[PDB]
């Protein structure tokens, strides 16, 4: 059963670590504890065609903690780019994250995720979110806190990497 390196990138505070931690333990962390460099987390999903394994490389979004930066991306087989719909700057930086990513990994499946859609004053309005179109990224609204589209980014990636459109999590 193969393992797929997944890199998780995007601005500080957007929800990368807390998204992954909820996927691993079921719990949702309220505090923001900035990641330093990267943390690798194995993350398995069980499917109707067997187990799929991701090594999730959860990278730091804060410049002062960026560490190796694009050196984390070497060998990545897929990626998620995360931003925060309550913060316009985080969507403004998505092209910079994507640029640095694809310069390292030319042809990998990437999902773009607008997080925090549970929050009432949404700033990055849905009509505004079009960057993924010309780059052939998948897009989802998610909420790590409220469990909205919580598995979809991994589901889409799993399908892409297994080459199996019928694959389902169980």
């Amino acid at each position: 059963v193969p393992t797929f390196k997944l890199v998780l990138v995007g601005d500080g505070g957007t929800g990368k670590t807390t998204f992954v931690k909820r996927h691993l333990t079921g719990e949702f962390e309220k505090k923001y504890i900035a990641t330093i460099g990267v943390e690798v987390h194995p993350l398995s999903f069980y499917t109707n065609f067997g187990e799929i394994k991701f090594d999730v490389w959860d990278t730091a979004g804060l410049e002062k903690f960026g560490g190796l930066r694009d050196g984390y991306y070497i060998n990545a087989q897929c990626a998620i780019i995360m931003f925060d719909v309550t913060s316009r700057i985080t969507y403004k930086n998505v092209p910079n994250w994507h640029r640095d990513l694809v310069r390292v990994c030319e042809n990998i499946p990437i999902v773009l995720c607008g997080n925090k859609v549970d929050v009432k004053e949404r700033k990055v309005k849905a009509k505004t979110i079009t960057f993924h179109r010309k780059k052939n990224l998948q897009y989802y609204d998610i909420s790590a806190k409220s469990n909205y589209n919580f598995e979809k980014p991994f589901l889409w990636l799993a399908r892409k990497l297994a080459g199996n459109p019928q694959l389902e999590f169980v």
């Binding site: 460099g37 190796l68 694009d70 030319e106 009432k120 309005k125 849905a126 609204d141």
Partner: protein
Amino acid sequence: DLDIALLDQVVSTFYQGSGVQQKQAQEILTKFQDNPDAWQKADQILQFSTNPQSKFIALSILDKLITRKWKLLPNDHRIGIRNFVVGMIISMCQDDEVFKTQKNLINKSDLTLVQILKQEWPQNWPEFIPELIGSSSSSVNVCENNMIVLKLLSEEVFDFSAEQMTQAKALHLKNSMSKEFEQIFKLCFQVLEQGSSSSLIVATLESLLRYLHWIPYRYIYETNILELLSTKFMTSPDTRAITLKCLTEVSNLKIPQDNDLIKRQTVLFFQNTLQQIATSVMPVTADLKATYANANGNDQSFLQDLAMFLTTYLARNRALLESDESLRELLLNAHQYLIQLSKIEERELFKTTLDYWHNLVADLFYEPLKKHIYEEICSQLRLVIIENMVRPEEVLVVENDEGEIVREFVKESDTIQLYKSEREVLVYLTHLNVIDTEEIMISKLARQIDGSEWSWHNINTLSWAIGSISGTMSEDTEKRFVVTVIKDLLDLTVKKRGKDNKAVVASDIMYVVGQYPRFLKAHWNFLRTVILKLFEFMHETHEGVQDMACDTFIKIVQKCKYHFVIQQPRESEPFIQTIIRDIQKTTADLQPQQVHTFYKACGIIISEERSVAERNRLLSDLMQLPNMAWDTIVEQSTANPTLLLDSETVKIIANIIKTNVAVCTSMGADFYPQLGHIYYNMLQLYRAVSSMISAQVAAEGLIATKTPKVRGLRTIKKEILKLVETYISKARNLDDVVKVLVEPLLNAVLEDYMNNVPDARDAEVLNCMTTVVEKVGHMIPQGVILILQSVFECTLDMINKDFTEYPEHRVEFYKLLKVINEKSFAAFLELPPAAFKLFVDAICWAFKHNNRDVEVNGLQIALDLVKNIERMGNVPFANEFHKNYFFIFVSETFFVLTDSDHKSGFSKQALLLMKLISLVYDNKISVPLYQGTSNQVYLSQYLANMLSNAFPHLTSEQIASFLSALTKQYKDLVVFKGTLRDFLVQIKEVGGDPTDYLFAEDK
């Protein structure tokens, strides 16, 4: 420390190992590449390592040097590093295995070259382009790699230079590329027309894609390149997608508008392209939905890119193709491919076509003489939209901090926004042909009934489509259409076997009727039957039905409330009386949350009652059950708080308060009398629960906060705060809020907040006080002072030890400070000087947060505070303030501006800094700021010294020239920000050009 072999091993442990050892290698590597001397290890790594990953890291290290310290370096080393990087790129190209299999490494090396070009070119490297062009004849690998280099140079100069370079530097590099582009184009065009190697051609077209972002249109329209893109590179498979991306950007060029030749060219490339797609790729008849599900080769991306090309070209150029009848078939075939693309199951691709269809159907609606050309397209489009309607309403199910499960509707989501777009298109299409629309939806429904297309998804989807076109058909056609639909669904329900299936169809009947309030309001008898049917469903235990019933009840009354408060012809009473009377029976099987929704629905209706005596009466009747429970339990339980150790009593009390909250939410101002009825005992209850919670948390610590007991109590506490907050936020009679509500409220919550232990203090107390200050702060100057005294220092102490603890309190604290500063600044004037210093301290502390929700308010407070002080004249508090704090704010603002990670505050940081400078340069500060030298010179001196101390690598010339610009630009926000951005670039490197700060005037 680490020689080459050991570095190789660390890298291979980091990338290929795992667990603890992988993490230990990470730390070694991260430290290594942050070492300021690391770059001498690097050439050595590059010369000797056997590990492409080691070489990547060595290049990152060299990038740090190039980007930050290149001008510290002797001209010798510069030419050496440049010669080294160029030769290394050539070796990697001339080595086949490396060229095949190490593309990320070559791409990284190419980017490193570009970083050098940014520093050196063209002024110290004028032969770079002719050299590059020349070396492209030397090898097909080198030529290809040269295209990557030019592509990255274009990106770094045009697409990504804003904010990474000074404005002056970026202009120089763009002018430099512009001047030499004629030769780059020559090379590029020559390769496109001759080259065989698909990989070379693909690289060439990737660079062309980037050039199209900025090149003058004449390279496109006055050469033969359009012909090649639209014929030659559409025929060969490997170039199709990238060629469509290029042609998408050709379609967006800045071109002349009153030019026949250019128009013909624009038609011709689209003609060529669509013909080539039909000849070589797939005919308009192909099932793209199945092709896309297959996913062969890169087909999904190609089809995505084709949707983009078609919609881009047509949104701009459709009238051009409509303007000549010889183009009709091209026009229609293009639209027919779009119809096929719109059927693909891929939401983002669908939205891309939908944006175009919206443009089209609006245009047919507003110019209906064109409509005949697109009749068939529109007909197929109704079907596509109907079959892809998404759900218009979505609910989140979450567990709150007291462990309760809470349902909330999503607002403004992508799904919801797509529903709205779909609806708009389908509204237009319905008016464009109402008979066709009607037929499509009726026959769609017949195919649910005959079972041929039956499924939960299809009936739901069809229901959302039907429910989206209320108010389109004219009232009488709508009536007949809706009757027909509802009857068809009622038969469908009877015909289907099994409760699951019947529940689905029943829920869709309730959905459709909720969406047609004109139809509902026209016939009371029907409306009344709907409501009575929903009440029947509130006893149905099948999953989802009770929630559906409650949601539809409130949805319908939001729209039809009037019909419930009047006495209808043939009835003895207003229907609201009937509802209230059977409320216990109607709700007996609902969960509490559902019961609260029901009570909220009742309050909507009651607010519609125009006479006050009668409305109060209705309210009183509505509230009879929770008041009966309240009057028997609450006072008793509050005089012996040992009765609240019963978790069952706590539960009953929580639900009473939530019932009040629900009714208050819908009735707002009209809820006053019911709030008054429970107010004093509610506040005694608040105190008793807050005491118990604090008592136990003190004795047991943090984990007491997770106990079933403390959660139930905190629920009562938070709901009480919610009810008061909800009422005050909607109050109309502010006199009563101030004279009756506020003072008891403050006496109950403030001192208790202060005396509670930190882990028992609820952030909701701060939120509630924010609402009080927002609403009536102008009327209670003394209450606002109390608020400050009670919550200011004790909350500051919770949040000033670190940046991470008590996240809710951080956010609510600065929200409250902000509103107090806007609405009752006089409270800050009354503070003693030591507490005012704490306030300034608190504002600066917010600046330092990497937390957008705090930072924004901190910055906003500072701006507001400065304006408040500026609005006091030449007066001594003002002048004292400036002498004490002017420079604290100047340096604090500078400190976050120049920090790496406070970029979201940039706009307000700039504004604050402009305001501070104006205070001095507009001679608005009447006192000297220093312990007859002007404040202007004293400020410039303070700033030079601050900056040379924080950024010692800056030259005096750089500082003089920045400060001279800042102090001249401080009325012009846009120019002012440009100068600050230039400064933020220059502090990250050595040897910036001080003439960059003259960019605005040079213009």
